[PDB]
Amino acid sequence: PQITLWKRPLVTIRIGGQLKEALLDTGADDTVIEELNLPGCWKPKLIGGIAGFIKVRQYDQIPVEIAGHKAIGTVLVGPTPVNIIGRNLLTQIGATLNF
């Protein structure tokens, strides 16, 4: 699909057997999903942006379906206003910017 940028690029993903809405964010290195009791051993991580850092739990090799496309990679779990799909998963689905 082609996603225009008139409104925030929000899409449906599937993670941990749950369906959620997430923002496709080319400015995010990593993927950050809101409080989700994900299974696995995780490692602590701090990630940052405007107004600073939050603590998150890093889970690896987590399958994430994005608009019907299967990806598998690192997901960071912590308190966020919006679920964010970052480049680590966008690349796995052949996503590009075009102009």
Q: How many CB atoms lie within 10 A of CB 45?
A: 16
Q: Are 13 and 20 in contact (CB under 8 A)?
A: yes
Residue 58: which of 80, 39, 43 has the closest Cα?
43
Q: Which of 25, 29, 30, 60 is catalytic?
A: 25
Q: Is 30 a catalytic residue?
A: no
- Partner residues linked to 46 by β-bridges: 55
On the CB side of 42, CA atoms within 13 Å amount to 20
Residues designated catalytic: 25
